[model samples]
Target: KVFGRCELAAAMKRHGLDNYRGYSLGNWVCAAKFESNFNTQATNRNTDGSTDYGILQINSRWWCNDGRTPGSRNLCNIPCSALLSSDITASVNCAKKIVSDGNGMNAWVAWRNRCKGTDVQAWIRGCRL
Candidate 1:
C-alpha cells in the first residue's frame, strides 16, 4: 500500500513507533518518506547482494531472511517477503527491534542523509494525533 503522509503517521503511531527509542514519530515519518515514499512494496538491492524491503527498507542481510543473502542473521526472524505487504506488522516490529537493538534510528542511511538534524517536525505537519 502506498500511504499518504498522515495515513502513514497514523499507522506508525498505532504500531508503537511514536516516541520510540527517543525518536519522535516525525523521525519515523521522515525516514519512511525518503526510504520508500511510504510504499509497502518497495525494495532496494545492496552491493553485497542483500535486499532492503518494505516501507522502512529494512535490510535482508541483518533483519530478514531473503533466502539469498548468505549469512543473513534474520534478526527480525521474518521472511523478507513479509515486509512487502500492505499489512506492515513485520515492518513495524522489525523497525522497533532495529532501534532498540542498539542500531538506533541511524540504521537507515536515508534518515541520516535527509532527516537527521533537520526540522523533522515538518514531516508530521498537520497530521493530527
Candidate 2:
C-alpha cells in the first residue's frame, strides 16, 4: 500500500487533490479505500473486458495503455503499469484531469456506487489530515 489515510491525505493535498475540481477530499478518500485500499499495485478486470488499474482503478478504456488494447484514448498517455508503481504523482495528475472533464468522480464507478451521497468522512476517520 502506498499510504495510510493520513499520509494519503497529505500527499493528495500536496499534489493538489484536496477538494479538487469541486469534489471533496472525503470523496477521494472513500474511493481509494474501496477501490484499492491505497495499494498502488491493485488492478482488476471488469466484466466488460476493460481492466481497471492501480489505486483509483482507472479504466483502460480511456485513461491509460493496457498494452493488449488498440486505439485506447490514453488521456494520461502513460502505461497502466505506471499507476501500479508506488509513486502516485502521475496517477494523481491523471485523476484530477479526469474529474476536470465535467464527469466529476462518477468516472470512477467506486465513487459513484460507494462514496456518493454517503457519510464518507468515515474513510478518513483516524487520519491526521
Candidate 3:
C-alpha cells in the first residue's frame, strides 16, 4: 500500500527504506513506533517547563538546542522542527548514531527477532524486497 502518513512516507522515500534494505530500517521503525506511532509531528510534555517535539521526540531546549543563546550551540538553530524537515537519511543517520554509535543495524536485527512472525514483522520482512 502507498503510505497515507506523511512522516513515515517521507522517511521511507528519503532513506530508501521503502524497500527496507538499509542497515537501520528496523530500529528506525521501532523507534518510530515506540516514540510516536510513526507520527512525525508528535510532541510531549516536559518537566522543566520545556517541551519535546518532532518524530524523534528530540527536546527543543536540550538535545537540539543545548540551551545556548545567541551562540553556536544555540537551541533555536537546532530546533526539533528542523530535524523533522530533514529526510529519512538524516533521521536514520541520527538514529544509527544513537542506537550504537552508528555501528551496525543490530537494533534492526533485535527488533526483527523480537517481532518475528507477526503482521508488522512480516510487513517489515517483506519490505526487505
Candidate 4:
C-alpha cells in the first residue's frame, strides 16, 4: 500500500537480504533500478483500476495478495511467491529459487547476463551501443 525510498530500503534490508548487516547496497540499488526504475509508488494500471498494485507491480487481485483472496490464500507466504508483495530482494530471491534452484551466485549469474559486461567496448556491445 505505502511506498517510497526508505520503504524500499527497509524492504530490501528485510525481505531480500540474507543478513541486514551483510547486504550489498549496490545490489539493492541496481535491483530497484532494474525492476521499477527506483519508483517505490510505481504501479501498472488496468482499465478497471482494480488490477495490479504497488512498486514491484504486484498483481494484488490475482497471483499475489495475502490470505485475503479466495483460492490464493497466503500463497505469498511460500517463499518466492511473496516477492512482488513487498520488497525487491524477495523478488530477487524468488527469481533465484526458480531459475537457479536456490544457488545464490547462479542467480547472480542470471542477473549478470541481463546486466553485466566485460571491458568498455564489451559493455557497450552488450548494450548494443
Candidate 3 clashes between residue pairs 3 or more apart in a chain or in different chains = 65-75
Residue-pair clashes per candidate: 0, 0, 1, 0
Full-model lDDT for every candidate: 0.93, 0.84, 0.47, 0.41
Clash number for model 4?
0
Best by lDDT: 1
TM-score of every candidate relative to the true structure: 0.96, 0.90, 0.50, 0.36
The regions of model 3 sitting more than 4 angstroms off are: 1-24, 66-77, 86-90, 100-123
21-85 in candidate 1: lDDT tens per residue? 88999999999999999999999999999999999999988999989999878998999999999
Report the poorest 10 consecutive residues by lDDT, candidate 3.
68-77
For candidate 3, the per-residue lDDT at 121 reads 36
lDDT of 2 by residue, 35-124 (tens): 898998998987667788888998888899888666567999998898888888878988988998877888888889989999987766
Q: Model 1: what TM-score?
A: 0.96
Which of candidates 2 and 3 is the stronger one according to TM-score?
A: 2
Error of 2 at 35 (Å): 1.1
Give a tens-digit lDDT track for model 3, residues 1-129. 112244464555476554343433444455456555565666676665555555555554434553432232333345555556534444544443444434343433434454333444333453522
Candidate number that wins on lDDT, 3 or 4: 3
Better of 2 and 4 by lDDT: 2
